[PDB]
């Protein structure tokens, strides 16, 4: 599910006094009047809060997996409309491959975080075919 | 057991209601009759004028075929394709034995009063 359109942008969510503000400025500063990239940023921020131990550390493998997952969701939403977009088809298939690679590395290094990631993002890890 | 696995290999190289109906399938496929019984029962339907074709099948091992001269009465004056079966069970005596078998079938048809009209013939 997407964030509500009334949610404030990530950059305008900790500014002091944002609750003492007129409705019109709230609309101007919401996801209703921004392109899709802020909504994806909000999704990423929510997942980082929900899954990882340190939401601020973005270089960790779990953070990269979450980022690639939101990107993959974006590609699937895009291809649901542009069925003949071969470039974005390539991008989606590749991104799935590297997310599988990151999941393999996380499994081999940190199993607890791997379980948490797989539960939080609804990812079913599958072992590669032998032939 | 050994022959069972062998016929499995040959098959590989080839590549309530249902129960009793499959039984009927086997029984109907296995039906056989004599020659004169054939002439008096089955030839009537096969000599109905119209568009028709006969796939006469002959066992290559069991040649000459004594049924071949009797075809004009059995099936009638209609198109006929002779199929030599069980060619895989024949040793390869020399290269091109298959052509020799095909020719031999052709002269065997010729000896009987069968018209040989292979390929394009005319209007």
């Amino acid at each position: 599910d997407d964030p509500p359109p009334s949610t404030l942008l990530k950059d305008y969510q900790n500014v002091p006094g944002i609750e003492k503000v007129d409705d019109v400025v709230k609309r101007l500063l919401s996801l209703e009047m921004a392109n899709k990239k802020e909504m994806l940023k909000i999704k990423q921020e929510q997942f980082m809060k929900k899954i990882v131990a340190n939401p601020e550390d973005t270089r960790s493998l779990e953070a990269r997996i979450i980022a690639l997952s939101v990107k993959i969701r974006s590609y699937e939403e895009h291809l649901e409309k542009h069925r003949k977009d071969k470039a974005h088809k390539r991008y989606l298939l590749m991104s799935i491959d590297q997310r599988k690679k990151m999941l393999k590395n996380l499994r081999n290094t940190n199993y607890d975080v791997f379980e948490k990631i797989c539960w939080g993002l609804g990812i079913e890890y599958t072992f590669p075919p032998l032939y | 057991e050994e022959r069972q696995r062998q016929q499995r290999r040959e098959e590989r190289r080839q590549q309530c209601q249902r129960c009793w109906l499959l039984s009927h399938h086997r029984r109907a496929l296995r039906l056989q009759v004599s020659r004169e019984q054939y002439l008096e029962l089955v030839s009537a339907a096969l000599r109905r004028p119209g568009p028709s074709l006969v796939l006469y099948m002959v066992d290559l091992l069991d040649l000459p075929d004594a049924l071949l001269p009797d075809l004009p009465a059995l099936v009638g004056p209609k198109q006929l394709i002779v199929l030599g079966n069980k060619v895989d069970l024949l040793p390869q005596d020399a290269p091109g034995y298959r052509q020799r078998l095909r020719e031999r079938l052709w002269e065997d048809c010729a000896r009987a009063g069968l018209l040989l009209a292979p390929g394009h013939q005319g209007p």
């Binding site: 950059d11 305008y12 900790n14 500014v15 002091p16 | -």
Partner: protein, 51 residues
């Protein structure tokens, strides 16, 4: 006796490991202090711009 000697050598290397890691902890503390100062300055500037 040889196993006892191996255990003693392991303990000695463990003490050396503790010394090295305490050193590394101290330089890491001062490094992260400097880096956190930089991050604090950046955060102040950015938050004020958004205000």
């Amino acid at each position: 006796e040889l196993m006892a000697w191996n255990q003693a050598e392991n303990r000695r290397l463990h003490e050396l490991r503790i010394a090295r890691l305490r050193q590394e902890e101290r330089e890491q503390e001062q490094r992260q202090a400097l880096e956190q100062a930089r991050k604090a300055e950046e955060v102040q500037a950015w938050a004020q711009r958004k205000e």
